[PDB]
Design a protein around this nucleic acid. Structure first.
Lengths: 176, 38, 94, 141, 164
RNA sequence: GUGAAGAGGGAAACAACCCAGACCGCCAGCUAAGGUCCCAAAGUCAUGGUUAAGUGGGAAACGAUGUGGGAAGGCCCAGACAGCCAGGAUGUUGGCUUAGAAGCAGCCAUCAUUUAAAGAAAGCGUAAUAGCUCACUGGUCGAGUCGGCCUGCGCGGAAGAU
RNA sequence: GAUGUCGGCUCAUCACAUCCUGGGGCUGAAGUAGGUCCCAAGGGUAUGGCUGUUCGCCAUUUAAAGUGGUACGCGAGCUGG
């Protein structure tokens, strides 16, 4: 609720364009960085964002923190470009990029054909380490989340794709 | 994990979060705590 | 601690008292001393959130009715059939 | 998880940290190679006696970088020695297996001084008081 | 208001000494680290310099309840305060002991004999012999300029007439 | 009371329910219980409060960090409450126990130090040292926040012969 | 003044609280495998004996030998034992 009162004051040369309830962030080095308030109304003002209750609703605080968070996230996306450093632990898996394709093994006899969305790009320094590039904070973690789905950091020996919030707590083996 | 009913705090990092019309125990300490009905 | 108000009885009996609880009021009484029993009406939810802190019972009450103040401490309690909510409270003068 | 613990504990004699069991598991678990630590440790132990427990407090950083501090022999070792006891009672305070004077305690205190944080030499004595108390030595005024 | 006294007592306890200090130093760390704190407790008891790490919440209620000189514009944000009411030079040396284990751009301000000192000026200032060593160096500056310099010059002219 | 020994209106209907007590005839009006978007006759009623389950309009034990309002009150821009981040120290890996027993396997001490400050530790977790949260300390942080209680609404609990 | 019973075959049908493949959590689960475990009606789901007979005992198949109702399915079909 502290963060539904926050005015943001968006940086210089970021264009934040309001269709009312769709709010759209444009600037240099990227496209389609956006946010939807659906329960709550966000007026942009001159740059001091004001958050309040919408017509046809009863619901409160719920989308108004999200809208502040999500807009600021997208303004840094186009402003600095969000964090990029991905990595994985475990032998013989990889994440080696060649173009639009992420090359990996899952022990499968079919090609896995894990591919990157057309709206993002990647490169690799080394065959298990990935650097992703774009200006959207959502997308980069969404393609990471599907690449982890069944290779999520295990609670035992930690093996998995590692990026952001992580559940691994380590265990020692059973007594002999 | 057991399906259960009545939602309780299994540990200090069980956040307890309402997904659809059932309250789920969702934890970021241990995956052991993912309780299916509340 | 608490500074509350009361009305002197327009209406008395069981028939009377059901129409107070219908309107979220209930009755009460201040007895003792050399002087007459002071029958009063209170509001229910005016006191219900006061007596949620223990200071309702540890400290004396400012109860003003026809602008008269004599000071009061709580006595034995009358309760609704299925709620700990107050159907009627007894009081003694302090 | 960054997997950090600050002020990681060891108490071991100076010439026996080559095997892992005298050191226990925790150093491995914060990533300090046991062999490498034993070599780094040996350069300042040449004035120390074989078999005598040396206190060691380690900080480990996130990137598995480590720094390590080496300390003068325990208060617990000096008090057992001065009392003529091999071992404690295993019951503190209610079981007496000997006694120790305030005047012996003050010499124990001055040998620990450079590690002690106390602003008075007495302040130091009061910290080592409870070491005598755990081992079943009564602290006489 | 608070329900307990702890926060209100500690504002008065710092304010007394912090108005009083002949030098004080207002610094940034946001997690001061206990290894450093303990060595700075250790050498502070040698110099009789005192040190506290202290919230901007405590200090801002301090600026409201009590008038301050030369330190209050620096109380915003994360703050350590090392201070002496005695030996002014040692208080300013304490930041050079902390700068041996830490970043030196982190001072926001100082006071010295009631002067406001900005974050950039103190780094020269702070070398700072203590008040007894200073007074004796000033006293030598005037005793020397009065009669010693006169004679230096009366010699230098006799020397030019001396011919080789 | 009704049916038994009575017609009509309402209930998805019936021989006892709720309203009501058919003399007949009248393309007459009102009222009852019950209703008022379509079946199907009338309110998508005016004002305010709230939920998102077809709860409503299907029932309990039971439970929690589901969600709002309200009044009374502590906290309350002089900085909250809670998390996240960083610090978590000196004796000290105290004594017993042991591979080491180290706040968190067991048992006893339950202390003392420079300190604005860090329990010889509240709870978690492969037996465990671990990894982690935790007050307390300091960041991020500049407005609501929490305990009690009244109250609107929720939940999962609530799987079967067509 | 007739709503008439048991077990089996033939032929069935409907409920899923699933015998099994399948997708997924936890694990005192390294992997495997098992313990724990949720979604799911779509489909396949054995035979000879003795007894009136389901169940039994015994020999036997297969990866396997399910759960519940039906005038306790089906005598204007059968064995009517």
């Amino acid at each position: 609720s502290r963060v539904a009162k926050a005015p943001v004051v968006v940086p210089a040369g970021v264009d934040v364009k309001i269709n009312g309830q769709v709010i759209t962030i444009k600037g240099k080095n990227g496209e389609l960085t956006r946010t939807l308030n659906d329960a709550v109304e966000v007026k942009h003002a001159d740059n001091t964002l004001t958050f309040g209750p919408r017509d046809g609703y009863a619901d409160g605080w719920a989308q108004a923190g999200t809208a502040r968070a999500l807009l600021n996230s997208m303004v840094i996306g186009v402003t600095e470009g969000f964090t990029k450093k991905l990595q994985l632990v475990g032998v013989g898996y990889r994440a080696a990029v060649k173009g639009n394709v992420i090359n990996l093994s899952l022990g499968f006899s079919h090609p896995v054909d894990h591919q990157l969305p057309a709206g993002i790009t990647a490169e690799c320094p080394t065959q298990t380490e990935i650097v992703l590039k774009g200006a959207d904070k959502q997308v980069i973690g969404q393609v990471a989340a599907d690449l982890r789905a069944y290779r999520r950091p295990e609670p035992y020996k930690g093996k998995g794709v590692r990026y952001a919030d992580e559940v691994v707590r380590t265990k020692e083996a059973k007594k002999k | 994990m057991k399906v259960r009913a009545s939602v309780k705090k299994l540990c200090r990092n069980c956040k307890i979060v309402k997904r659809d019309g059932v309250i789920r125990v969702i934890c970021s300490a241990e995956p052991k705590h993912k309780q299916r009905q509340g | 601690m608490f500074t509350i108000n009361a009305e002197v009885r327009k209406e008395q009996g069981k028939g009377a008292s059901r129409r107070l609880r219908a309107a979220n009021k209930f009755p009460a009484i201040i007895y003792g001393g050399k002087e007459a029993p002071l029958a009063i009406e209170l509001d229910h939810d005016k006191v219900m959130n006061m007596q949620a802190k223990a200071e309702f019972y540890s400290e004396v009450l400012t109860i003003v009715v026809d602008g008269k103040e004599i000071k009061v401490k709580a006595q034995d309690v009358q309760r609704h059939p299925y709620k700990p909510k107050l159907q009627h409270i007894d009081f003694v003068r302090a | 998880a960054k997997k950090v613990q600050a002020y990681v504990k060891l108490q071991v004699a100076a010439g026996m940290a080559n095997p892992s069991p005298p050191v226990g598991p925790a150093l491995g678990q914060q990533g300090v190679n046991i062999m490498e630590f034993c070599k780094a440790f040996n350069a300042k132990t040449d004035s120390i006696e074989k078999g005598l427990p040396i206190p060691v407090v380690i900080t480990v950083y996130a990137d598995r970088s480590f720094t390590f501090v080496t300390k003068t022999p325990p208060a617990a070792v000096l008090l057992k020695k001065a009392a003529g006891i091999k071992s404690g009672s295993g019951k503190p305070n209610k079981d007496k297996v000997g006694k120790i004077s305030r005047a012996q305690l003050q010499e124990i205190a001055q040998t620990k001084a450079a590690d002690m944080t106390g602003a008075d030499i007495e302040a130091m004595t009061r910290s080592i008081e409870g070491t005598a108390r755990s081992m079943g030595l009564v602290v006489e005024d | 208001a608070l329900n307990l006294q702890d926060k209100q007592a500690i504002v008065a306890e710092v304010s007394e000494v912090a108005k009083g200090a002949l030098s004080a130093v207002v610094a940034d760390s946001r997690g001061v680290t206990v290894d450093k704190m303990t060595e700075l407790r250790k050498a502070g008891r040698e110099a009789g310099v005192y040190m506290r790490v202290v919230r901007n919440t405590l200090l801002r209620r301090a600026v409201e309840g009590t008038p301050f000189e030369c330190l209050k514009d620096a109380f915003v944000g994360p703050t350590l305060i090392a201070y002496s009411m005695e030996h002014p030079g040692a208080a300013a040396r304490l930041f050079k002991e902390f700068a041996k284990a830490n970043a030196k751009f982190e001072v926001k301000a100082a006071a010295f004999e009631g002067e406001l000192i900005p974050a950039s000026q103190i780094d020269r200032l702070a070398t700072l012999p203590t008040y007894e060593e200073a007074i004796a160096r000033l006293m030598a500056t005037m005793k020397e300029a009065s009669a010693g310099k006169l004679v230096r010059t009366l010699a230098a002219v006799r020397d030019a007439k001396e011919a080789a």
